[PDB]
Amino acid sequence: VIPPISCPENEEGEFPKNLVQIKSNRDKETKVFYSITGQGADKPPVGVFIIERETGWLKVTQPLDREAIAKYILYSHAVSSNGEAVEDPMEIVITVTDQNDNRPEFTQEVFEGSVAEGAVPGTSVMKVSATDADDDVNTYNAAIAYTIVSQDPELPHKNMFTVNRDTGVISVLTSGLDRESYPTYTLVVQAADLQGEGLSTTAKAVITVKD
Ligand SMILES: [Ca+2]
Ligand SMILES: [Ca+2]
Ligand SMILES: [Ca+2]
CATH class of the missing domain: 2.60.40.60 (Cadherins)
Known part of the structure; x- marks a missing residue:
C-alpha cells in the first residue's frame, strides 16, 4: 500500500x-x-x-x-x-x-461600531474580522494579527482605540471621547497573516460616539 x-x-x-x-x-x-x-x-x-x-x-x-x-x-x-x-x-x-499566497481579507470593507462617550477605557467597541484562505491548521499562513493603522480624527488623542491583535475586537484605549467634538472615528485596521508579519489587508472601522 x-x-x-x-x-x-x-x-x-x-x-x-x-x-x-x-x-x-x-x-x-x-x-x-x-x-x-x-x-x-x-x-x-x-x-x-x-x-x-x-x-x-x-x-x-x-x-x-x-x-x-x-x-x-x-x-x-x-x-x-x-x-x-x-x-x-x-x-x-x-x-x-x-x-502563504493568500492575503488576509476583512469580512467587511467597513465595520461599524458605536461607543458611549463615557465608556471607560478597555471598553470593547466593535470587532473587525478577517479571514485567510491559507493553512490555519498546519502553518501560520492564516494566523491573523489585527492592528489599527490610523485613526481619524486624531483627537483628542492619536489613539482613542486599540484592537485586540488576535480577535480584532476594538476597544476604547483612552478617555476623552467627546461626541460633540468628535462624533465619529474612522480607523484603518490592518490584518496581516503570519501573525502580523505576513501579508496584509486593510479595512475601515467607523466608530460612532454615542451619548
Ligand atoms: Ca494557493
Ligand atoms: Ca495567508
Ligand atoms: Ca496557500
Whole structure:
C-alpha cells in the first residue's frame, strides 16, 4: 500500500515533476502498464497528475493550489500488456501543502461600531474580522494579527482605540471621547497573516460616539 504523497503548491521549475513511481510486484511475469483515475488525473481537474504508463512514475503536471484542492485521491491501475488488471486499483493520496499566497481579507470593507462617550477605557467597541484562505491548521499562513493603522480624527488623542491583535475586537484605549467634538472615528485596521508579519489587508472601522 502506497505511502502518503505530498506536493507543495505554487511549485516552480520544470514540469512535469515526479511524485512517486508506483510498481507492481505482480509485474515480472508480465509487462505492466500504469494509469491513474481520480480528480486531478482523469477527472476534473483533469491532467494535473499523470503516470508514465511504462514506469509508473506519477507526476504532477502543473503548480497546485492548496486552497483549490488540498487533497487528491487518485487510483493507479496496473494492466498487463495482455489487457488484464494485474492488481486492484491502488489508492494514491496526494496532499497539497500550503504556501502563504493568500492575503488576509476583512469580512467587511467597513465595520461599524458605536461607543458611549463615557465608556471607560478597555471598553470593547466593535470587532473587525478577517479571514485567510491559507493553512490555519498546519502553518501560520492564516494566523491573523489585527492592528489599527490610523485613526481619524486624531483627537483628542492619536489613539482613542486599540484592537485586540488576535480577535480584532476594538476597544476604547483612552478617555476623552467627546461626541460633540468628535462624533465619529474612522480607523484603518490592518490584518496581516503570519501573525502580523505576513501579508496584509486593510479595512475601515467607523466608530460612532454615542451619548
Ligand atoms: Ca494557493
Ligand atoms: Ca496557500
Ligand atoms: Ca495567508
